Structure 1
């Protein structure tokens, strides 16, 4: 897609831990966190966080059941987030970056944040970081 407010949320697995990955669909910009468990509470909280930082209008996911819980629904309700029904793989890419930098850090969560840094700063010609900023700016002005 190309629309400024569309985000993609999924959980992926590494080392028996779970990684919540949000992708800004138009930019390829990523926000990712290690969460203790794959619950609605964790997703609901992350949504709240994400919505305060970026203008989040619609959220897509590859696992619809992610968004069925009352907590998640409460977050989408309060932040004014609709579910994306317009989109009918960066978890592969992010895992590559985590694997390259894993030895550098003790905790997986630390390695994840390093991978988010690298991904968002690498120029492919802008970076994902510059792309998101320009996309939201030109949409605002």
Structure 2
């Protein structure tokens, strides 16, 4: 255990590895690896969307794009007012976790209805990827145009072909697999951070070898069945449970 922790500290001192790789390679828990990364001075977005409006055959197509993956949601609006833009934004925020929105300085994007929807759903709106995605979507729409009768059907069929049929990039994935992988990784990080804060509200008094006096208050990092990892003096060390006393700490 302690051999793995010292090997992980030496390896991070050379190459600055990440915590998932260190936890998988050196066989230590994930909270200890996250602490090793958090003690480094040289080591210290999944929810941002961009919106735009475009025209096709006298109809208004509104396109939202997820930036970190290239994922697309599109619609056909009856007009270009602010009420229909606010309804499209409310539907997008109901289906996906949206926290940061990037638009241009259009009229319908600068409106009281969009402002009220962003207030209720707690979105940060900023005025200034979507143009490249609009061009790629319109090439698909002219490619599969004769398989449909109306324009709304052709728009949704092109959204399906873009999201689940075109593969590329590094590993050769579509956009739907990339957005699900990105959001799942963020969910793992937030759950581990909750566990880290709940564990680190404690404090440890430990009794060193060949001494009968208790040492200073060391912060708890990991508590096992027979081992305890503590931080003391900018040092991590492993003390067994028979020489430890864990007490609550109120040091806010």
TM-score, length of structure 2 as denominator length: 0.53
1:100 aligned onto 2:132: no
| Larger relative strand fraction | 2
The equivalent residue for 1:48 is 90
Deviations 1:26-71 (A, max 9, x none): 1100000011111111110011100011110111123443421111
The equivalent residue for 1:123 is 167
Deviations 1:88-132 (A, max 9, x none): x11000000110011111111100000100000121111011111
Q: Quick check: 1:56–1:81 contact (8 Å CA) kept in 2? A: yes
- Structure 1: gaps of 5 or more residues: none
Higher relative contact order (CA closer than 8 Å, sequence separation 6+)? 1
1:110 aligned onto 2:157: no
Matches within 5 A, 1:18-29: 18-29=60-71
Higher deviation after alignment, 111-120 or 53-62: 53-62
Q: Distance between the aligned counterparts of 1:12 and 1:5, measured in 2?
A: 23
Q: Quick check: 1:8–1:22 contact (8 Å CA) kept in 2? A: yes
TM-score, length of structure 1 as denominator length: 0.92
Aligned pairs, how many?
138
Q: Quick check: 1:60–1:84 contact (8 Å CA) kept in 2? A: yes
Q: Quick check: 2:50–2:102 contact (8 Å CA) kept in 1? A: yes
Q: Quick check: 1:32–1:113 contact (8 Å CA) kept in 2? A: yes
Secondary structure in 2 matching 1:65:
coil
Larger Rg: 2
Q: Aligned in 2, Cα 1:86/1:67: closer, same or farther, shift over 3 Å?
A: closer
Q: Distance between the aligned counterparts of 1:74 and 1:10, measured in 2?
A: 19
1:69 aligned onto 2:111: yes
Q: Distance between the aligned counterparts of 2:65 and 2:108, measured in 1?
A: 16
Q: Quick check: 2:104–2:128 contact (8 Å CA) kept in 1? A: no
Higher deviation after alignment, 56-65 or 32-41: 56-65
Secondary structure in 2 matching 1:115:
helix
The equivalent residue for 1:4 is 46
| Larger relative helix fraction | 1
The equivalent residue for 2:182 is 135
Please identify runs of 4+ aligned residues in structure 1 that moved more than 3 A: 62-66, 84-87
